Amino acid sequence: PQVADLKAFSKHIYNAYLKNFNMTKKKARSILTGKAPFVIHDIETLWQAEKGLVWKQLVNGLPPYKEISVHVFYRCQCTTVETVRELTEFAKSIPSFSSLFLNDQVTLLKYGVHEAIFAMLASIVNKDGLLVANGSGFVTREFLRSLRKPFSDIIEPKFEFAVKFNALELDDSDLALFIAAIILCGDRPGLMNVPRVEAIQDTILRALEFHLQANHPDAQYLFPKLLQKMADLRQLVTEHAQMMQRIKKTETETSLHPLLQEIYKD
C-alpha cells in the first residue's frame, strides 16, 4: 500500500510536468538524434539565427547590444527566467507545494530553481552542444567555449555535469520526481515550516525510489546515484553563484535581469 499510494502520487507529479514544461526530454532527444536544427557555431551563424529563427524573447526586448559574449549571456538569462516561470507553475501544480504558505513557496523556488534548471538542462544537451529556440537551433559547445572569459567559464561546467547525468538515461517520468525533490527540499535557508517540507520531500523520494524500481528494473545503484547528483547540483550552483558574483563585480556594463538579482540577492 505504501508502493501503491506513491504510484498515484508519481503520476500526479508527471502530469504537472507534462502540463508545464515547454520541451520534454523525449522531444529533445528526438531532435538531437535526428528522430533539423540550424547550427550556430560562429558569429555569422549567430547573426543568421537571430534573423531567421523564432525566439520566445524578441531580440528588440533584450538589453541594448554590447558584444557577442554578452549577447549570448542575455539569451542565457532569457531562458533561465523563462524556466523559472515554468518551474513555478510546475511546483504550484503539486498540491502539497501549493498548501505551503506563499513565503515558504518563494523560499523553496529561490534556492531550488537553479539546481532544477541545471538538471533539466541535461535533457537538451549532448556532448557537442545544446538546443535553443524551441529546438529549432543548436549551439555548439566549442562555440560557447570560444566566448571570452568570464562567459565561457560559466557555461562549460554545465556541459560536464549534463553529459554525466545523461549517462543515467532518466526519462521524463523520472525527471518529474527528481525535479520535484530538488524544489521540495527541507534544507533551504529561512524556511518557515521545515518539518512539513521535510515530510513532503521524503514522500517524493520514496515515490522516486519505487518509480525507479518499476521503470528501471535492471539498473544498479540508480537511486543512490541520483541522491549523489542532488548533492552535485548544490555544488554546481554554489560555483555558478560565485561566477555570477564575479560577473557583477567585473562586467559592470552587463545587465542582470531583476528576478535573477533577487535570487542572488542574499
Ligand SMILES: COc1ccc(-c2ccc(C(=O)N(Cc3ccccc3OCCCCCC(=O)O)C3CC3)cc2)cc1
Ligand atoms: C543566437 O545565438 C544564441 C546563442 C546561445 C543561446 C543560448 C540560449 C539559452 C541557453 C540555455 O538554455 N541555458 C543557459 C546555459 C546553458 C549551458 C550552460 C550555461 C548556461 O547559462 C549560464 C548563464 C546563465 C545566467 C543566468 C542565471 O544564472 O540564471 C540554460 C540554462 C538555461 C544557452 C544558450 C541562444 C542563442
Ligand SMILES: CCCCCCCO[C@@H]1O[C@H](CO)[C@@H](O)[C@H](O)[C@H]1O
Ligand atoms: C517566481 C520567482 C521565484 C524566485 C523568486 C526569488 C526570491 O526573491 C526573494 O523575494 C522575497 C520577497 O518575497 C524577498 O524577501 C527576498 O529578499 C528576495 O530574495
Ligand SMILES: CCCCCCCO[C@@H]1O[C@H](CO)[C@@H](O)[C@H](O)[C@H]1O
Ligand atoms: C534586464 C536584463 C535582463 C535581460 C535578459 C532578458 C530577460 O528575458 C525575458 O524577460 C521577461 C521579463 O520578466 C520574462 O518574462 C521572460 O520570461 C524572459 O525570457
